């Protein structure tokens, strides 16, 4: 069907199984002193994390104070200059002998592809943390400073009123 | 190879986010009538803590199951209103998820 | 919107679940 069937073990665990789970896990721990499914109550025991700390799904694999970059910068600049130079040479190829133009085209793309690699090491979450950091920091400083400004102006008004009433005495 | 129970339970949890899946599951009588399914739903609650929460793909179902948790004391009735209510309350629920995680 | 791009949706894809190994796992639930 369109919707896959519920998992099979879901139907094994009734309320009685839930209430008898404590004694079952106590007995299992006492006896113990891929997990084989010898009893229907085994699944409620929390599954163990794989030792390799890896998870595979759909053909793809998955697994501290914030809780020479100049070399990369100059590499990027020289790569951009070489990319412009190669673009000029490739368009010249198109001009004179376009029949073999593709011979350079993908080459240029490789440099562009390398640029993407040069982005990968530069990857930005810390920079986003920084920018959010300063925006809420400056917002709270603005709120604070307007607080002492308003309380100070109220105090100044109170002192002026006190002087006015003392003069009228 | 045969996938482990981790993979199937995680995929079930992430598929619970679909409104069509929830509507289909609640359409059948014996799914809600059987206490086994709700027992499994309450068993699934323990994935809201790390490091299990680091392995999720769509955080919305995190509330949905919790919303489904509410369904055990709110009633089936309300199945018809489920798509409308999720569409209407998507903004504030996304905001509260962001507050729970992004802050 | 009209171009169905793979592996990037807001909600879990129905085709992703169909192609996921959970489908055959449910089919091979007897073998489990």
């Amino acid at each position: 069907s369109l919707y896959p069937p519920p998992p099979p073990y879901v139907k094994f665990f009734t309320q009685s199984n839930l209430e008898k789970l404590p004694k079952y896990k106590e007995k299992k721990a006492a006896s113990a002193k891929e997990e084989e499914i010898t009893c229907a109550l085994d699944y409620l025991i929390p599954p163990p994390m794989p030792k390799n700390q890896q998870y595979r799904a759909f053909g793809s694999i998955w697994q501290e104070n914030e809780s020479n970059y100049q070399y990369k910068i100059q590499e990027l600049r020289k790569l951009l200059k070489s990319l412009l130079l190669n673009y000029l040479e490739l368009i010249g190829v198109l001009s004179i002998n376009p029949d073999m133009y593709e011979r350079k085209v993908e080459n240029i793309r490789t440099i562009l592809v390398n640029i993407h690699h040069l982005l990968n090491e530069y990857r930005q979450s810390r920079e986003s943390l920084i920018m959010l950091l300063e925006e809420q920091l400056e917002y709270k400083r603005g709120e604070i400073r307007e607080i002492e400004q308003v309380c100070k102006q109220v105090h100044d008004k109170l002192t002026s009123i006190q002087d006015t009433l003392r003069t009228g005495s | 190879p045969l996938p482990t129970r981790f993979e199937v339970e995680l995929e079930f949890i992430q598929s619970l986010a679909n409104i069509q899946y929830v509507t289909y599951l609640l359409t059948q009588q014996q799914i809600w009538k059987s206490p086994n399914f709700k027992n499994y739903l309450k068993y699934l609650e323990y994935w809201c803590n790390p490091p299990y929460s680091q392995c999720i793909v769509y955080p919305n179902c995190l509330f949905i199951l919790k919303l489904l948790n509410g369904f055990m004391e709110s009633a089936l009735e309300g199945l018809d209103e489920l798509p409308k209510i999720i569409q209407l309350q998507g903004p504030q629920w996304m905001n509260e998820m962001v507050e729970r995680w992004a802050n | 919107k009209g171009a169905v791009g793979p592996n990037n949706f807001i909600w879990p894809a129905e085709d992703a679940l169909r192609r996921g190994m959970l489908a055959m796992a449910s089919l091979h639930s007897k073998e489990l």
């Binding site: - | 289909y24 018809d80 209103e81 409308k84 | 169909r18």
Partner: peptide, 25 residues
């Protein structure tokens, strides 16, 4: 003429009961 028209009694909240099954290829 027409004494009174009918009040709109639409029920979009109705979930419908369309059976879906031939999705697998």
């Amino acid at each position: 003429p027409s004494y009174s028209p009918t009040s709109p009694s639409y029920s979009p909240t109705s979930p419908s009961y369309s059976p879906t099954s031939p999705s697998y290829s």
